[PDB]
Each structure stands twice: as C-alpha cells, then as structure tokens.
C-alpha cells in the first residue's frame, strides 16, 4: 500500500491560517457565556446595565447574565493553536474552543503545556503510519505538529540523553481510544528501537505489540469486569515497562500490576458483574473445564459473583473463554498449570457457598452443610474436615505457643470473604508473572520507558469507599504532575535569568492528600474504628466530622441530598472538584482478616499452584489487616516507581457518548479535562507569565508599533525592549529573559489590538494609494479621448 499524506490531519495550512487570523473580531464585545445545552456559547455584548450584561447570541437571542459569568475570548491569532499554553486567554471556554476547532478541522492532537490531548475522531486518520512516524524521529516537540509520536520520541531521546528511565501516563475513559493509543505508543518504540535481533524474532515471536496484546485475554479475563459505565473496565493499574539495551534497542518488556479491586471478587453492585473469568468458565465452551471445576450450569449457585448482573449483551462469554483458553496455550502455560488456574478460580466460587449457622446462644459457629466445602477441598487438594476445623477454630500466635480461638458466624463468614479475595489476588499476581516470562528476551536491560494505565478520577451521584480510594490515587498522580511541571518551570526561569519565587505546585494538593492518609486522617480514623466493637457507621461519621470539620480545610459538609437517598456524610475539596462521600458500610468493607491457619493448610495441600501463589506467605503503615492499609502500601509502591522516572502525560478524550465523528459534547469534555488534570495545569500556568515569545518572533510581529524607534537596531532583544516600552503596557506585565520575553495572561491580546489597529490603518492607506494609481491610470485614458 501507499501511506496517505498525514499533512491534512496534523497541520493547519498556510491558506487556512491566514483566513483564521484576518477574521473580523471585536475584543470589547466578544465573550463566552455558560449554556445548559452547549456548555458555552459565543456571544456579543449588546449592553451593560450595572452588573447585568446583555449578550447577543447566534440567532438573535439576547440573554441577561451576571458579569462574573461573562468570560473573555482569544483573538484570531490563537485560533487552532498547537500549544494552548500559548493562548493569551487561559480559561475553560477558551480551552474547549481551541480543542473543538482543531477537532472540527480533523486535527485530533493538541498540546496544553506538558499534556498531549488526543480526541478520538471515530475515523481512521492516517496518523499512525510509518510515513507519519518518520516525521517525528529525533525532532523537538516544537519542530513538528502535535502528536503522541512526538511525546514518545521525546521520552526516547530523553532516556538516551539523560540516562534515566521514563514514564508515560495515559488517561482516558471508555470510548476515548486509550487502548489504541497505548498499542501505537508500544509500536512506535518498537520502531525506533528495532534491531537485527528484533526483526529476526519478529516472524517467530511477533512484534512487541503483538506479544503484549497476546496477554490481554488472560489478564483481562481475571482483571476486567463490567461496570456501570464500561462493559470491559480494567480493575487494576498496569505499568508496561519497555526495556532498552545499552545501544537504545529493544530489550524485552514486563508488566507490573497494582491495586486490583479485590472487593469485586465477592461483591457486586446491582448493574455490574464480577471479573469476566467466572462467567467465561461457566459458559461451558471449553470441553472438560466445568467437570474439572465441579461447576453447575447455574451461576446463582455461586453467590459471591451473582449479586448484580451475570450476562452482558455486548459480551459472548462462550467465545471469550475459548480465546482465553487458547491464550493460556499460546503463552506457555502447561496443561496442568492451566487446569489448576481453573480449579483455583472455581474453588473461590465454591468457598463462597460454604454456609455456617449458630446453635442456640452458643457463640461458636458450625457447618451448615459440607457439600461446598468438599468441592473446595477436592480442588485445593486438602482435607475437608481439617478445613472446617481451621475455619471454625483457628489457632493464633500468642508467643511461642499456638492457642485455639473460637469464631462466630460473622467472623467465619468474613474470613471466607477474605480468603476468596486473597486467593484470587494472589492468583492474578502469578498470572502476570507467567505472562512476563513470554516477554523476557534475556537481553541486557539498561533503561526502560514505562506506560501507565490506571483508572482516573471519578465523581458519581453516589461516591463510596472505592471512589475515595481511586480519587486518593489520582490526587497523588496529579500532585506528581504538578511537581514535575514545577521543576521544569523553575529550570526554565533559571535558564532565562528571571526571578522565580513560586512554591512547589504539588503543595496545592498536599492538604487533601494529608487529610486522607496522615494520622487522624480519614483512612486512619477508619482503621482505628475497628479497635472499638461498639463502632457503627454513625460513630465513624461523627468522629470524621468532630476531628476535621472546621479544622481541616479540604474537609467540608456534604452537599444537600436529592431526597433522602443522596445523603452523604462529608466532602473533600479535590483538585477535580468537591466530592461528597457516603460512608455506609466502610467499617465492614475495610476488614480483611486472613486466616493464617487455613493459609498454612493451603501451603501444604496437593494443588501445586495453590502452594506457589502463597509462596511468600509464612502462615502457621496503619491498621493491621485492613483494605485501606494494603491500598496505601501499593499506592506508595506505585508512586515510588514513578518518582524514579521522568514522566510524560497523554490525555485521551471521548468527545461524545454516541461515537459520532465531528461532535464535541462540551459538558462531557469539560468533565474529563477537570478529572485528567488539564484544567489544573491551566490554573497553574496562568498564575505567572504563561506566554513566551522568542525575541526574533516578537520583533517580527510588533515592529510596526514603532519602526522609527528600532531603526538600525540589529539585536532583536533590544528591539523588543524598545517596542514594549513604546506601548502603554504596565512595567510588571512582562519579563525580559535571556532569549525570550515572558507575558502575563491577556497581555498579548492587548498587543494584538495595537497591531490590528496600526496594520488596518496603514493597509487602508496602501489601498487608497492603490485606488489612486488605478484612478490616475483611467484619468489619462479620459484625458486623451476627451
């Protein structure tokens, strides 16, 4: 085939650019106002009566709106600008407008400072071809149009130049194209890092992209689930490290996983499923599996995975399991290993069906049947009578000796749930380890570029324990971004010889992070409540308010509810907005008591895979044995890994919920730009001097404001100084750097007004002389014929 020219999908043409920049525009009347339907509308101020502005809209409507809601517009010079950090007006409607206008012109990539924004076109644009990729090899970001390839190549160069590992954090909700963008980043590194050895094994093993994708059926069967907002949602953070050798060629890859949503193993909301694997195995599409697993044809026999939905219209679980079983074969799992994976997965389902009861007022619990336990025992290769004994009457370490302890119905029931989640979590870890063996090339690993995929900030009508956890995670991730931007800005100002006094932009998020994680914080209070058997949801809610309301700035009263249901207990001022949290059940959800006696039995059972996945357990930060403490531990492990890399940031956007090309749902995109940090980035950069022009560019642009003043001055820095001083600009509205001039927000908009007025006047003169030339030409014709 021939690669289509990517120019129409990356560049604004010279012709189009001069059309945009000469468009009529009134700085005094143009404005953005909010609108319920379109998010924002472009308007013209018709009149102002005190604080009330009368704004004309397209169509003739005139709307009275308070002045505080009337926002400024960017002048035509900044139309479809490639890096929105160069806009003189930096506000939400101006960001939406620039993104929208580029999208309408088939341009899906836009920079916003460090961020590279990719808006899914729902069309096949020729932007991933080799022809396109070659445009970006070794090019600086400002030498070529915006592209994820520019970010990818930049991380590659920085790795080779700085000798430091890199990270690429890619965000995107369902429909945003995050998966496609991740595949093409991997493919891009496979291109610039290709070698005689990689091209050799590329016909037998396949390309790096194919090798990684070949792990999807396994990792997604066990790690993905149908949520309310996504039929195939990843329930874990994934860090794909792409390793390079001492000469910058591919050196294999490995996958690290974080924060698997263990709770989903034993609990589902009414419109969600558990992990796909449970329904895949139950489909019966692979002969022999269900017999090996002792499974029935009735999903509702297994309560732990049948509390919400059990089928999904867009998923053929029978076909998926056939592909999952094939992937196990392709990935080098032995027949025995594969069937033991199935056995353990089914044993988790059976464990959930083990019932217990109380006889009289005796606190001790006992079996309520043994059929379910027997199946667990067969699959795990352990003794049934011993399993119940270890569940009903475990032994605890009291110093030297082991003492038997009693358990009631609730205590044994909670231990089952913890065992179901624990086994599944350890099985998933092992599956990742096995998948990484297929990505290992034994080559010398020098540095890596790691691609991070982890769920983004979420705000729902109901925000529970899981919302706080992932929002806690994204607060730390956004602080990570703020700090990186801070470091680079500090280096830029030093490099330019301009005074810098700003505090670390990450400090802005610290009060919220500390409210969640520090002692006496939210998670700490939750963990400490378990030391009080009298504790209830209200006792916990009261201690949060008593400790933090009016004392921790990010802790706020919850929004008033819609009827009684929406009633929440407290709110947090996150970077992405105020979030109200309902603490119902948090005390129960956070308990995670693993029965060490049972684990010891598992470690001596006949199922060899069960032994392996518990290998690092030797059974015989905050609150011990809680979900919150384990969550904090893995989050800190993730952040430590990231803080040892130099990061890059890609933001994938879903423009509309119908997959329609060329349509931008303003409210939907605004919500994403708030959750993915783009607007936080705007908030930071506009605080100082966001806009910067090289001195030759400034002189070229604004020389007309004082041609006499700069006559004969060769140095463009001196010319810039003369030109600015000849304007009415305030002395503190700019900064003169070594190689560029810095400007506060809105100042270049004023320079454009000066330029427009002077250019329009002189052009009218020039055209008046043109009409005089053509007129005197025609007057000589009349003078001769008369």
């Amino acid at each position: 085939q021939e690669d289509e020219d990517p120019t129409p999908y990356l560049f604004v043409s010279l012709e189009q650019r001069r059309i945009d920049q000469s468009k009529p525009y009134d700085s005094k009347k143009s404005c953005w106002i909010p609108d319920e339907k379109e998010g924002y509308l472009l308007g013209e101020i018709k009149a102002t009566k005190g604080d009330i502005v009368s704004v004309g809209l397209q169509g003739g409507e005139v709307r009275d709106i308070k002045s505080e809601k009337v926002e400024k517009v960017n002048p035509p010079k900044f139309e479809k600008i490639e890096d929105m950090a160069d806009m003189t007006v930096l506000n939400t409607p101006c960001v939406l407008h620039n993104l929208r206008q580029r999208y309408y012109a088939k341009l899906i990539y836009t920079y916003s400072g460090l961020f590279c924004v990719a808006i899914n076109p729902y069309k096949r644009y020729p932007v991933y071809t080799n022809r396109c990729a070659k445009m970006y090899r070794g090019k600086r970001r400002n030498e070529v149009p915006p592209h994820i390839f520019a970010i990818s190549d930049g991380a590659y160069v920085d790795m080779l130049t700085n000798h430091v590992n890199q990270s690429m954090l890619i965000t995107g909700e369902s429909g945003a194209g995050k998966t496609e963008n991740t595949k093409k980043v991997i493919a891009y590194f496979a291109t610039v890092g290709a070698s005689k050895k990689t091209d050799e094994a590329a016909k037998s093993k396949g390309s790096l992209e194919d090798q990684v994708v070949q792990t999807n059926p396994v990792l997604e069967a066990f790690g993905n689930a149908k949520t309310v907002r996504n039929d195939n949602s990843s329930r874990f953070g994934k860090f794909i490290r792409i390793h390079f050798g001492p000469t910058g060629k591919l050196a294999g890859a490995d996958i690290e996983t974080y924060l698997l949503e263990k709770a989903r193993v034993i609990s589902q909301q009414s419109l969600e499923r558990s992990y796909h694997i449970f329904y895949q195995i139950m489909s019966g599409s692979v002969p022999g599996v269900k017999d090996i697993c002792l499974l029935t044809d009735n999903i509702y026999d297994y309560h732990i995975v049948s509390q919400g939905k059990v089928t999904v219209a867009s998923i053929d679980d029978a076909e998926e399991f056939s592909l999952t079983d094939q992937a196990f074969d392709i990935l080098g799992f032995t027949k025995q290993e594969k069937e033991d994976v199935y056995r353990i997965t089914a044993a988790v389902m059976h464990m959930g069906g083990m019932k217990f009861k109380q006889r009289g007022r005796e606190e001790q619990a006992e079996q309520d049947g043994e059929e379910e336990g027997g199946r667990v025992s067969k699959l795990f290769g352990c003794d049934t009578a011993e399993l119940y004994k270890n569940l009903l009457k475990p032994r605890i370490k009291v110093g030297n000796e082991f003492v038997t302890q009693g358990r009631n119905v609730q205590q044994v029931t909670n231990s089952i749930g913890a065992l179901c989640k624990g086994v599944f979590d350890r099985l998933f870890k092992w599956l990742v380890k096995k998948c990484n063996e297929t990505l290992d090339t034994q080559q010398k690993r020098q540095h890596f570029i790691g691609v991070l995929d982890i769920a983004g900030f979420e705000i729902f009508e109901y925000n529970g324990f899981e919302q706080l956890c992932i929002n806690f995670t994204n607060e730390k991730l956004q602080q990570f971004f703020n700090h990186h931007m801070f470091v680079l800005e500090q280096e830029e100002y030093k490099r330019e010889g301009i005074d810098w006094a700003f505090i670390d932009f990450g400090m802005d998020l610290l009060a919220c992070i500390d409210l969640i994680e520090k002692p006496m914080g939210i998670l700490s209070i939750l963990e400490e409540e378990s030391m009080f058997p009298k504790a209830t949801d209200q006792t916990f809610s009261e201690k949060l308010t008593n400790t933090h309301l009016g004392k921790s700035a990010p802790f706020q009263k919850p929004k008033p509810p819609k009827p009684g249901q929406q009633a929440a207990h407290f709110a947090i001022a996150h970077y992405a907005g105020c979030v109200s949290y309902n603490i119902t059940g948090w005390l129960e959800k956070n308990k995670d008591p693993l029965n060490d006696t049972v684990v010891d039995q598992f470690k001596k059972s006949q199922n060899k895979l069960l032994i392996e996945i518990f290998a690092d357990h030797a059974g015989q930060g905050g609150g011990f044995a809680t979900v919150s403490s384990a969550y904090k531990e893995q989050l800190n492990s993730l952040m430590t890994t990231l803080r040892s890399t130099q990061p890059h940031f890609v933001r994938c956007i879903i423009p509309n919920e119908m997959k329609q090309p060329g349509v931008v749902d303003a409210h939907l995109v605004m919500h994403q730009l708030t959750c993915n940090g783009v607007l936080e980035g705007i908030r930071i950069c506009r605080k100082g001097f966001p806009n910067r022009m090289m001195y030759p560019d400034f002189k070229m642009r604004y020389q007309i404001l004082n041609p006499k003043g700069i006559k004969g001055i060769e140095d463009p820095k001196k010319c810039t100084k003369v030109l600015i001083e000849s304007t009415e600009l305030n002395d503190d509205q700019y900064r003169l750097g070594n190689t560029k001039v810095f400007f506060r927000a809105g100042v270049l908009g004023q320079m454009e007004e000066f330029r427009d007025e002077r250019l329009g006047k002189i052009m009218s003169w020039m055209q008046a002389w043109a009409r005089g030339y053509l007129s005197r030409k025609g007057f000589k014709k009349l003078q001769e014929q008369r």
Binding site: G760, W765, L782
Partner: protein, 154 residues
Amino acid sequence: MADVPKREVENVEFVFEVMGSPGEGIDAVDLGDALRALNLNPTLALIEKLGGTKKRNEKKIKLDEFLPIYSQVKKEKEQGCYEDFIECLKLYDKEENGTMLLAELQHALLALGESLDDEQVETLFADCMDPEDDEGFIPYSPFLARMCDRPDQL
C-alpha cells in the same frame, strides 16, 4: 476656496473639464477619482466624510465647493507614503531581505483595511509586481515604488 495657489486651481479646472460639466461641476460619486486625478490618495472613509456619494446624480459639486475639500485633503498629513508601506510589509518579511509571499500580499489587500476586489489587485499586480519565485516570493519594494510613483526608489 480662494486660498489655493492659482496654478493648483488650473489643475482642478482641468479635472472638472475632463470629468465634470461646465454648469453642474462633478458628480459626488466621482469625488474620490477627482481627488486622485490631482495626485491625492484619500481613503474611502475620508471621501465619505467630505461628501462623497455612491450613486450617480444624487449630488453635484461645483468648483468653488470642491476647492476647500481639495485643500483639506491636501493639508491632511497622515495619509500614508512609500516609507510607511515598506515598514508595513516587513511584517511579512521573515528573512529581512525585502521579499514576501505574493499570496500574503494578495490576501492582505483583499481582506484587511478598505479591501480591494480581485480585479483591482490583478491590474495592480500586472502593472507593478515583478514575477514570483518558485517558492512564491516577490520583492515588495519595487512594487510599492511603481504603485506610489517613486522612481527614486528603483
């Protein structure tokens, strides 16, 4: 009226002979062209401000009524010149070598200020513009010298 040098009056009279009628004078729709015939270059805004019209036979201007108009335009001073136009087109001279893209100048004349039409630019370029490069560049100093009748700049 009576405060114009006699030689200048004779030039005006010659324009009125060619353009106007002995009795009525000139039609107000020709005020701009009459001022241009006298080597002035008023903007459309200045013409309109001084009584110019857009339909013929709506207004007539006698000689004695035209002289103070002519005098005011001739005394008005910020009306542009070759040197101002050089500085203006430097805004399109990235290489600081006295050249610009022909397409940039055509767009500017058709989209900014008191824009011309395609036919006027075509005639203007054919008479005053040198051929363009393969890159699309032209020297704008010779073009302006011819348009402004400044042979000293050639």
